Specification:
The chain is mainly alpha-helical and about 160 residues long. It contains 10 helices and 3 strands, in the order αβββααααααααα. Strands 1-2-3 form a 3-stranded antiparallel sheet. Bound molecules: the ligand *SCC1=C(c2ccccc2)C(C)(C)N(O)C1(C)C and chloride ion (4 copies). Keywords: Antimicrobial, Bacteriolytic enzyme, Cytolysis, Glycosidase, Host cell lysis by virus, Host cytoplasm, Hydrolase, Viral release from host cell.
Length: about 160
């Protein structure tokens, strides 16, 4: 297991534009296209992202290319953020992946605002952090995925992704 395999499990793989858990147009491995309710706006974003006229369909190679960029973007987001970087730097590689996962799903500023959870993670209060993270819109709207991510922070193991 690693961040790529982890997010591949959590985001799935679809080659046609579809609506994500929030109802937003997405493609590939959780590549969010736009929050706009316009399918044409989503198609425009996709064509721009891929560099060709796709009409809402991409190849597996193209999906993986966007995925690599998005994972890279999540890491860069963490490193440039004054709140996220110290927590990230303080963690082992398994827990770093859990933080990247959160950033990928909710964005840099989204995770950066979880002040109390971040403090508990920084302090290595793993059970407390885990309990605190569950007190969130995130956990309530995507509980199975949140449970996996939280287990990763609680244990520092890949146990939640083993038989997946
Ligand atoms: S969500 C954090 C809370 C608790 C806790 C859970 C696991 C480890 C440490 C603390 C506790 C004590 C059950 N609780 O009532 C909190 C503050 C809601
Ligand atoms: Cl998804
Ligand atoms: Cl704890
Ligand atoms: Cl809550
Ligand atoms: Cl879920």
């Amino acid at each position: 297991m690693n961040i790529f395999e982890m997010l591949r499990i959590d985001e799935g793989l679809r080659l046609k534009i579809y609506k994500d858990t929030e109802g937003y147009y997405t493609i590939g491995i959780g590549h969010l296209l736009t929050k706009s309710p316009s399918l044409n706006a989503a198609k425009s974003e996709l064509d721009k992202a891929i560099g060709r006229n796709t009409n809402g369909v991409i190849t597996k190679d193209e999906a993986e290319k966007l995925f690599n960029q998005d994972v890279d973007a999540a890491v860069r987001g963490i490193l440039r953020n004054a709140k996220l970087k110290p927590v990230y730097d303080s963690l082992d590689a398994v827990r770093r992946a859990a933080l990247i996962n959160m950033v990928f799903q909710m964005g840099e500023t989204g995770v950066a605002g979880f002040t109390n959870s971040l403090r508990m993670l920084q302090q290595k209060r793993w059970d407390e952090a885990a309990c605190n993270l569950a007190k969130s819109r995130w956990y309530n709207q995507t509980p199975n995925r949140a449970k996996r991510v939280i287990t990763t922070f609680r244990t520092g193991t890949w146990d939640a992704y083993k038989n997946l």
